[PDB]
């Protein structure tokens, strides 16, 4: 896991975020109103990074891009799109060296599991297991380059929310908007699976988020990351099968900068139009 410090090159790209990232503030029902409130959000048009690290079998000559450091910054955005369900969990914390509890997520397989263990680093004890059609349960082998820790607390298991929907050779179908928020009451999570036909262009349609889970924790988070580097080993070096080869990840991200929004619930109970206040003088007037 972590990385093989293969920091070949870092091209920073900036993209204009269109109308995106509107979520339900509180679990109260309303309909056909124009209630306005202030809360943690991200601006309607804010430049965000486009971390072009999707090296599905390399970009050009196994041109793989790493993602070692990513600071939390009081709240985080996330998005990605890919046919292969290579996306696997997120990591949060400040030091990530058995000094602060780190949020580790394992998806797919049997069921999604979330842990806040105080482990030293990514253990990867069984992250490569019974994959493809090896169809033999040796269980003797283990992931090589790094060891495993033991300290753990607050194990949580549920149905895998990292849903691949229908993984098929379609035009473009998968867009996950896993939004993570940190407050004292509980670490809050939102998601929205949307099919969009553009891969480079972030969709301009107006979708909304829905709450997922209410896990109570009050630990400090300063940096985030995601490790798709499980099964990165070639299995047998002659075999040369790391899934397909190595991995790939989009992890299109951004930061919040809270503000005051005006949300208009529709007749049925969903969000049809939201408007900012400080975006422009016209926004202030609205």
């Amino acid at each position: 896991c972590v990385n093989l410090t293969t920091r070949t090159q870092l091209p920073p790209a900036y993209t204009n975020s269109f109308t995106r990232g509107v979520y339900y503030p509180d679990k109260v029902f309303r309909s056909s109103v124009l209630h306005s409130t202030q809360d943690l959000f991200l601006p309607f048009f804010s430049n965000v990074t486009w971390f072009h690290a999707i090296h599905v079998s390399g970009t050009n000559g196994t041109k793989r891009f790493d993602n070692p450091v990513l600071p939390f910054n009081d709240g985080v955005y996330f998005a990605s799109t890919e046919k292969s369900n290579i996306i696997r969990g997120w990591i949060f914390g400040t030091t990530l060296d058995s000094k602060t509890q780190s949020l580790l997520i394992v998806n797919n397989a049997t069921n999604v599991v979330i842990k806040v263990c105080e482990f030293q680093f990514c253990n990867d004890p069984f992250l490569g297991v019974y994959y493809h059609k090896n169809n033999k349960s040796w269980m003797e082998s283990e992931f090589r380059v790094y060891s495993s820790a033991n300290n753990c607390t607050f194990e949580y298991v549920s149905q895998p929310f990292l849903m691949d929907l229908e993984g098929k050779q379609g035009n473009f179908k998968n867009l996950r908007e896993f939004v993570f928020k940190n407050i004292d009451g509980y670490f809050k999570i939102y998601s929205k699976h949307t099919p969009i036909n553009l891969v480079r262009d972030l969709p301009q349609g107006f979708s909304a988020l829905e709450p997922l889970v209410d896990l109570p924790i009050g630990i400090n988070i300063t940096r985030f990351q995601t490790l798709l580097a499980l099964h990165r080993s070639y299995l047998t070096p002659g075999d040369s099968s790391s899934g397909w080869t190595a991995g790939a990840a989009a992890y299109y991200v951004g930061y919040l900068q809270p503000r005051t929004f005006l949300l208009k619930y529709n007749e049925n109970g969903t969000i049809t139009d939201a408007v900012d206040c400080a975006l422009d003088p016209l926004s202030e007037t609205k």
Partner: antibody
Framework: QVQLQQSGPGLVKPSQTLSLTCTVAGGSISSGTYYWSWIRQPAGKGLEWIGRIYTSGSANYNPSLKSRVTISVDTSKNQFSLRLSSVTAEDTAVYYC????????????????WGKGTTVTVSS | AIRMTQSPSSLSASVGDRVTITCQASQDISNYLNWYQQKPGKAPKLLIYVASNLETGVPSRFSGSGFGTDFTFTISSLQPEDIATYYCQQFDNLPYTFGQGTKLEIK
């Protein structure tokens, strides 16, 4: 030892509907693990995949032929069928039926068992 | 559609030599490459579903390597029974498209 055996007419007049059927043995087609496909190969030419159908009923075809081809499944009798309309001189080929198997954790896709094929000729 | 181009369309070789055939896809297909065998007068038979492993009943002499868009299939020691046509096939695009084929002959 699942084997697939084909029943066809062998000959179809021009501008008539070709009907083929592939009988699956060694197991029921109602298993959700397989995709059942028709493929064809013209005499002396390469292989061209025609289409698949998932066991649930969902079907997919090569776009160049989507309008004229129809693949159906009958799990209650463990066969699946092909109907190709507006047969032309290029429709003469050997037609194979085959099972595809795939996993979700790793979306690799491959044809692990094939049928024997059936020669379709389009002549008056 | 995705176009697949193999370096040899036909070849003649002798018993015991190592033969290598390449396949190149029009754009990056990761490792979504399958290998088929067409015996004279026989039905198509899957040989290499994934380069890493060999399908049941496939002779051990068949192996695969390569990356990105270019992939290699090797037979470490050709035998007379290996006379056949080998096709590579991507499944990155929606159609399960196949290559043009490489006829491997035995001297």
């Amino acid at each position: 030892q699942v084997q697939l055996q084909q029943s066809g007419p062998g000959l179809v007049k021009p501008s008539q509907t070709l009907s083929l059927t592939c009988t699956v043995a060694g197991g029921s087609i109602s298993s959700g693990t397989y995709y059942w496909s028709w493929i064809r190969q013209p005499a002396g030419k390469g292989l061209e995949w025609i289409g698949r159908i998932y066991t649930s009923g969902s079907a997919n075809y090569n776009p160049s032929l989507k309008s004229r081809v129809t693949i159906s499944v009958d799990t209650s009798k463990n066969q699946f069928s092909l109907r190709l309309s507006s047969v032309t001189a290029e429709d003469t080929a050997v037609y194979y039926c085959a099972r595809e198997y795939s996993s979700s954790y790793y979306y690799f896709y491959y044809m692990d068992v094939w049928g024997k094929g059936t020669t379709v000729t389009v002549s008056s | 559609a995705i176009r697949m181009t193999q370096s040899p369309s036909s070849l003649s070789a002798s018993v015991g030599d190592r033969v290598t055939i390449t396949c190149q896809a029009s754009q990056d297909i990761s490792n979504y490459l399958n290998w088929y065998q067409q015996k004279p007068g026989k039905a198509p038979k899957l040989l290499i579903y994934v380069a890493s492993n060999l399908e049941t009943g496939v002779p051990s002499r068949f192996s695969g390597s390569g990356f990105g868009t270019d992939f290699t299939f090797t037979i470490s020691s050709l035998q007379p029974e290996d006379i056949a046509t080998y096709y590579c096939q991507q499944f990155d695009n929606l159609p399960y498209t196949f290559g043009q084929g490489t006829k491997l002959e035995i001297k």
